[PDB]
């Protein structure tokens, strides 16, 4: 019976040791799971709330980049996120459209496109050169039109210049000058009549 | 021999105390870690499967909004997501080009841009008015064109109106009235010459 | 007291069974959080580091598609992600602009919009046919202009064709011919007067 009691104290002795062992083991198991759960929680991306209708990214003022996004189907009503390489595809066409539009306007203003054209501000204004046809027609719905601002053109045998009202007035003058001379001539004729009548010898 | 029993019992009492403490540490430590994990599990954004090739946002048929997204690099083949700021910039440009286009068509119609213009319905037509040069040329690949539809231009000393065919004709109808005049006097003169070769008195 | 011994042997056997139970408890509780975490670990989407400046999706080289994205706000400074449907809409507009730009250029180079038109390669070039007025004006900043390349207009009392300098020449050539007759005529008249002077019957 000395041996029964002795046995018991040994058992207790070992139990005490085991309890201390377990204590440290539990302390460190628990602290492990915590650190891991904690870091996951500190790196995981999260829905704002239970509805999951919004994710407000966690980078702060400068915000957060999302990279390695596969190109999203670009179709009517697609719910896929689009990347910068897809936005760039569009930015190229738009920038082209912007250019083609500027190039048109700075081509109409400086008159290098259209039927009526002029290469430089001091240049011959040309009307439908590259095309053919025999006729230019200036009439409109109010009727025919006067063509003004017309500087007089060369008057020779090969001239294609158009002529103006001053050049017409000049002609008109000659005519009246000549009708006058002719009238004088007729007078001069009447006189020769009377002289052949009235003379004697 | 007798005291040993008593001493064993106090040892048991403190052993039993410690087992209680441990059981109580464990329950609270694990309950705590299990909650943080639960919250984490419900709220975290996830990949659909182990390929990580897809994220189907959990917001139901309405979808999820992702925000505080940083400006993805807008470059060829970029894989950064792009936000609404960046799409808005393109959209303005598109509205810019769209509204550029519409107005270019309207004005070409309205005759308020280019070399030839006309403010309104009964406004005068102008040709190259804000530019220089001293020549308008209507020759095409078929050669010189007849310019027509021209209203009769004023005839006087400073008239810069072109002359039409109704006018040139008139001038000619005066020349044929002069040639008539000369024909008459040519005959009168011939008749005078006979009278004078014959008279005696 | 022998009853007391076995009673103590017994409670010690239970303490030992209970330390065991506790070692079982902790292992299965800890493994349980471990699995639940490792699963979270492998499918949660992750921030790259603690700044949360970047999420590099785990899809590998080909990438991750993000789907079920709700239309983001489109407005200056918006940090909402945007989806394929949205890019599609902008893409549609760009396409329409692209076509209209090219359609416009082609219409200019064909002579079919504006006031100066020509519905056919060998056709009547028309000026402001559809609108009205009575004025075409070709005067720039260098003053008035010489309209050239003008083919010989028709000459009759209803013609509305502009006449060129070569046709003016005809007028001024008849004119001289008139004067030459008038000159020879005047001389004949003087010859007649001097004849009436010296004639002795
Ligand atoms: Cl565009
Ligand atoms: Ni006589």
Q: Which 3-state string (H, E, C) describes chain C?
A: CHHHHHHHHHHHHHHHHHHHHHHHHHHHHHHHHHHHHHHHHHHECECCCCCCCEEECCCCCCCEEEECECCCCCCCCCCCECEHHHHHHHHHHHHHHHHHHHHHHHHHCCCCCCCEECCCCCCCEEECCCCCCCEEECCCCCCCEEEECECCCCCCCCCCECCEHHHHHHHHHHHHHHHHHHHHHHHHHHHHHHHHHCCCC
**Residue-wise over A156-189: b if at least 16 C-beta within 10 A, else e?**
eeebbbbbbbbbbebbbeebeebeeebeebeebb
- Verify whether the Cβ–Cβ distance A136 to B122 is below 8 Å: no
**Pairs of residues, one from chain A and one from chain C, whose beta carbons lie less than 8 Å apart:** 350
Chains in contact with C, where contact requires at least 3 CB pairs less than 8 Å apart: A, B
Q: Which ligand is nearest to the CA of C98?
A: 1
- Count CB neighbours of B101 within 10 A: 20
Report the residue count for chain A. 201
Distance CA C86, CA A79 (A): 9
Q: How far is CA A110 from CA A76, C8, C127, C139, in A?
A: 42, 114, 20, 17
Q: How far is CA B76 from CA A86, A188, C85, in A?
A: 8, 100, 20
Q: Which 3-state string (H, E, C) describes A2-26?
A: HHHHHHHHHHHHHHHHHHHHHHHHH
Taking contacts as CB-CB distances below 8 angstroms, the residues of chain C near A97 are: 94, 97-98, 101
**Which of A91, A7, B195, B4 is CA-nearest to residue C1?**
B4
Kindly give the distance from the C-alpha atom of residue C196 to the centroid of ligand 2, in angstroms, as a whole number.
7
Taking contacts as CB-CB distances below 8 angstroms, the residues of chain C near A78 are: 83-85, 87-88
Nearest residue, CB atoms, C88 vs list A62, A76, A192:
A76
User: Judging by beta carbons within 10 Å of its beta carbon (0-12, 13-18, 19+), is residue C5 exposed, middle or buried?
Assistant: middle
Structure tokens at B51: 């390929």
Distance CA C3, CA A156 (A): 155
| A41 Cβ contact list (under 8 Å, min separation 6) | B36, B40
Structure tokens at C159: 């013609």
Kindly give the distance from the C-alpha atom of residue B197 to the centroid of ligand 2, in angstroms, as a whole number.
9
Kindly give the distance from the C-alpha atom of residue C193 to the centroid of ligand 2, in angstroms, as a whole number.
12
- Residue position matching structure tokens 């005759």: B111
Taking contacts as CB-CB distances below 8 angstroms, the residues of chain C near B44 are: 40, 44-45
Q: Which ligand is nearest to the CA of A101?
A: 1
User: Can you point out the beta strands (E) in chain A?
Assistant: 54-56, 65-67, 116-117, 125-127, 135-137, 146-148
Distance CA C161, CA A20 (A): 123
- Residue position matching structure tokens 């000026």: C127
C146-148: strand order across its sheet: A116-117, A125-127, B135-137, C146-148
What DSSP element (H or E) covers B117? strand B116-117
Distance CA C128, CA A40 (A): 77
Distance CA A174, CA B175 (A): 11
Q: Which region, left, alpha or beta, applies to residue A156 given φ > 0 means left and ψ of -120 to 50 means alpha?
A: beta
Could you give the 3-state DSSP secondary structure of residue B155?
Answer: coil
B59, A51 contact by CB (below 8 A): yes
Q: How many helices (H) and strands (E) does chain A have?
A: 3, 6
Radius of gyration of chain B from its Cα atoms, rounded to whole angstroms: 55
Distance CA B106, CA B158 (A): 38
Kindly give the distance from the C-alpha atom of residue B86 to the centroid of ligand 1, in angstroms, as a whole number.
15
Taking contacts as CB-CB distances below 8 angstroms, the residues of chain A near C161 are: none
A137, A142, A158, A180, best to mutate vs chain C, most C CBs in 10 Å: A137
Kindly give the distance from the C-alpha atom of residue A200 to the centroid of ligand 2, in angstroms, as a whole number.
6
Q: Which ligand is nearest to the CA of C197?
A: 2
What DSSP element (H or E) covers B56? strand B54-56
Q: Which residues pair with A140 in a beta bridge?
A: A143
State the DSSP code for B198: T
Taking contacts as CB-CB distances below 8 angstroms, the residues of chain B near C60 are: 52-53
B70, A65 contact by CB (below 8 A): yes
Q: How many helices (H) and strands (E) does chain B have?
A: 3, 6
Q: Which ligand is nearest to the CA of C200?
A: 2
B32, B128, B191, best to mutate vs chain A, most A CBs in 10 Å: B128
């Amino acid at each position: 019976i000395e041996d029964k009691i002795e046995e018991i104290l040994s058992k207790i002795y070992h139990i005490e040791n085991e309890i201390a062992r377990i204590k440290k083991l539990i302390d460190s198991a628990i602290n492990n799971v915590n650190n891991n759960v904690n870091e996951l929680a500190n790196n995981a991306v999260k829905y704002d709330d239970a509805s999951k209708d919004k994710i407000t990214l966690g980078g702060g003022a400068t915000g957060t980049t999302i990279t390695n996004v596969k190109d999203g189907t670009v179709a009517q009503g697609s719910k896929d996120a689009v990347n910068g390489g897809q936005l760039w595809n569009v930015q190229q066409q738009v920038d082209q459209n912007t250019t083609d539009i500027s190039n048109i306007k700075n081509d109409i203003n400086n008159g290098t496109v259209g039927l009526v054209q002029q290469a430089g501000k001091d240049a011959p204004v040309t009307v439908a050169k590259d095309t053919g046809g025999t006729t230019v027609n200036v009439a409109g719905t109010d009727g025919n039109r006067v063509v003004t601002g017309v500087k007089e053109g060369a008057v020779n045998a090969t001239s294609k210049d158009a002529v103006n009202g001053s050049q017409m007035k000049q002609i008109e003058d000659k005519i009246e000058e000549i009708l006058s001379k002719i009238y004088h001539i007729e007078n001069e004729i009447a006189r020769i009549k009377k002289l052949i009548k009235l003379h004697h010898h």
